[PDB]
Design an enzyme around this catalytic site. Structure first.
Site, short mmCIF file in Angstrom:
data_model
loop_
_atom_site.label_atom_id
_atom_site.label_comp_id
_atom_site.label_asym_id
_atom_site.label_seq_id
_atom_site.Cartn_x
_atom_site.Cartn_y
_atom_site.Cartn_z
N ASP A 18 0.76 -1.19 -0.05
CA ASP A 18 0.07 -0.01 0.04
C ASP A 18 0.83 1.27 0.04
O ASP A 18 2.03 1.13 -0.28
CB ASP A 18 -0.97 -0.13 1.18
CG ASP A 18 -2.22 0.70 0.88
OD1 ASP A 18 -2.29 1.67 0.44
OD2 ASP A 18 -3.22 0.04 1.12
N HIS A 68 -4.51 5.95 3.32
CA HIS A 68 -5.08 4.83 2.65
C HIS A 68 -4.63 3.40 3.51
O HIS A 68 -5.19 2.69 3.70
CB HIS A 68 -4.85 4.65 1.16
CG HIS A 68 -5.43 3.46 0.66
ND1 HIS A 68 -4.78 2.45 -0.03
CD2 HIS A 68 -6.54 3.24 0.08
CE1 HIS A 68 -5.63 1.63 -0.61
NE2 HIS A 68 -6.88 2.03 -0.69
N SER A 104 -11.22 -2.14 -1.44
CA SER A 104 -9.97 -2.60 -0.73
C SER A 104 -10.39 -2.70 0.78
O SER A 104 -9.81 -3.79 1.37
CB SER A 104 -8.86 -1.39 -0.59
OG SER A 104 -8.41 -1.24 -1.68
#
Lengths: 9, 477, 92
Positions: free
Chosen positions: B26, B59, B219
């Site tokens: 990520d 994120h 995700s």
């Protein structure tokens, strides 16, 4: 929905 | 107080992850955040394109938190290790993702631990090299969990979503509906394995070391499945990818998504599953899944093939076409292992092959074929499937087909398997018959007025027509 | 028989960098040799290249920064299976 996630504003 | 998404994946009867490691590819992450501090190890592997600070690791922090956060995580124990393949604007490269996957494999060879789960919360367009690398890392024994993609589109056009032998996960909301935001939303299609909560998921926020935010994506949805997979592999460390995928399917809530959201042609191809933890109740049991092939294309001699995992048995084979221009299906051997092959008709736009793949250890299975005579064959131990194919352009343990057709019977020697045949006809665009509770649908076929195809949907046999009769074969211990 | 591939979504392509993918059984010693060969045949033609990475472990091969002009040449190297142009992936 946040802009850090593609393809959101 | 319990967040909706965590309640949603709680089974109707209930009572992790520490022996399992979960790699994450990520953005950077705020590894001091109290949700995940002492639990995520930053590898400091980094391979990101250049840009074109609390936003740089938003994120990835949230996802680390969804998998493993101590308040709001799915598998609250699990150890994580994190590679940086996405830059501060959320962008990365295929090339960089390749080198990450290579890095995880080199680390495993150097210091082996237990089972490994790799979360891939990214996508781009279809990529041959990225799909090959995922496939290869899967065959070496690693489990990969991947986002379906966020473009309200066929997931088979994106990677690693479309990759073979990866677990691809779409997103649903609190109403069990597919996430949709304008022309954006969860991808769908036959490359999606299952859905999970992916809208308004509370998780660790990198704004402050104790803050929390709600994010949505596929995700987030793949992160629930990675955490479920980690706890499944902590309890049964020895599961193969076939055996883990059959359990994720079996323990999913079923027929809970409203297929109207999907474009018409994709409702048949998209699994109606929302993921869930396994209950307290779990004895051997017969697990089967349905595998839809790629569409065959419109060449006159086109065939579609559907394959099972190496440790699964193909117990039945069927086919479907939207136009009904079709020459059926047959089971054929290939590398010593049976596959399901469907035939296009001259002038048709193509067909799907639809396999039913089951975990049936100790099973000796064979095929019994009768060329045109109407036409009949039988298992001379238990009939698990009937198939049929013809070469013309138009018109007990026993299979029966049209007089001009070949008829193929799947016969398995399975001591401890009981099987029965259930029928239902009516005067009708779609006719249906389902196995009783505790039985597994192993085969689904229509009796030989013009049918589009037949497919097993969970434990229901579905027959699609333009006195039509559906026939389900159902088995248990 | 070697083929070339690039992202169908034109905005997501990253021309100028290529993943050269070699045949399954190729050994790391062969991968490194095929890269130096590419660099040498390119320099003979006036092209600078840069080998950014040599894959081994899952896929054998390497990552090269070069002009697209060389693709017909690189497709002809020994051991080559196929070549793919680099492209973008995004946080989902």
């Amino acid at each position: 929905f946040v802009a850090t996630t593609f393809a959101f504003x | 107080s319990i967040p909706w998404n965590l309640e949603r994946i709680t089974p109707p009867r209930y009572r992790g992850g520490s022996l399992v490691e979960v790699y994450l590819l990520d953005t950077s992450i705020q590894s001091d955040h109290r949700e995940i501090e002492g639990r995520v190890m930053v590898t400091d592997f980094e391979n990101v394109p250049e840009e074109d600070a609390s936003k740089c690791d938003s994120h990835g922090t949230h996802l680390a938190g969804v998998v493993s956060g101590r308040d709001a995580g799915v598998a609250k124990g699990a150890s994580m290790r994190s590679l940086r393949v996405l830059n501060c604007q959320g962008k990365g490269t295929v090339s960089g993702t390749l080198i990450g996957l290579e890095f995880i494999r080199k680390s495993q060879l150097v210091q082996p631990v237990g089972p490994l789960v790799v979360l891939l919360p990214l996508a781009g367009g279809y990529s041959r090299v990225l799909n090959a690398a995922c496939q290869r890392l899967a065959r070496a024994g690693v489990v990969l969990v991947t986002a379906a993609g966020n473009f309200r589109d066929d997931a088979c056009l994106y990677s690693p979503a479309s990759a073979p032998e990866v677990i691809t996960v779409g997103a649903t909301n609190a109403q069990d509906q597919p996430v949709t935001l304008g022309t954006l939303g969860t991808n769908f299609g036959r490359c999606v394995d299952l859905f999970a909560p992916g809208e308004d998921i509370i998780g660790a926020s990198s704004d402050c070391s104790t803050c929390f935010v709600s994010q949505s994506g596929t995700s987030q949805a793949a992160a629930h499945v990675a955490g479920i997979a980690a706890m499944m592999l902590s309890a049964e460390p020895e599961l193969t990818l076939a055996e883990l995928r059959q359990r994720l399917i079996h323990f999913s809530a079923k027929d809970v998504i409203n297929e109207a959201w999907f474009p018409e042609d994709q409702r048949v191809l998209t699994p109606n599953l929302v993921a869930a933890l396994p209950p307290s109740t779990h004895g051997w049991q017969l697990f089967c899944r349905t595998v839809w092939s790629a569409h065959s294309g419109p060449t006159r001699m086109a065939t579609a093939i559907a394959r099972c995992a190496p440790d699964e048995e193909l117990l039945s084979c069927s086919s479907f076409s939207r136009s009904g221009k079709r020459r059926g299906e047959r089971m054929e051997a290939q590398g010593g292992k049976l596959v399901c092959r469907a035939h296009n008709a001259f002038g048709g736009e193509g067909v799907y092959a639809i396999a039913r793949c089951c975990l049936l250890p100790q099973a000796n299975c064979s095929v019994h074929t009768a060329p045109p005579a109407g036409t009949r064959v039988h298992c001379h131990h238990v009939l698990t499937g009937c198939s049929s194919h013809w070469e013309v352009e138009d018109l007990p343990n026993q299979c029966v087909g049209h007089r001009e057709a070949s008829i193929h019977a799947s016969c398995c020697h399975a001591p401890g398997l009981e099987c029965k045949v259930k029928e239902h006809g009516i005067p009708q665009e779609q006719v249906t018959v389902a196995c009783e509770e505790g039985w597994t649908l192993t085969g689904c076929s229509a009796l030989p007025s013009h049918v589009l195809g037949a497919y097993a949907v969970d434990n229901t046999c579905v027959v699609r027509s333009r006195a039509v009769t559906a026939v389900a074969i159902c088995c248990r211990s | 028989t070697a083929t070339f591939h690039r992202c169908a979504k034109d905005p997501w392509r990253l021309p100028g960098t290529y993943v050269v993918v070699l045949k399954e059984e190729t050994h790391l010693s062969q991968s490194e040799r095929t890269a130096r060969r590419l660099q040498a045949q390119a320099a003979r033609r006036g092209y600078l290249t840069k080998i950014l990475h040599v894959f081994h472990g899952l896929l054998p091969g390497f990552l090269v920064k070069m002009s697209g002009d060389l693709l017909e040449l690189a497709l002809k190297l020994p051991h080559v299976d196929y070549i793919e142009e680099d492209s973008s992936v995004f946080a989902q």
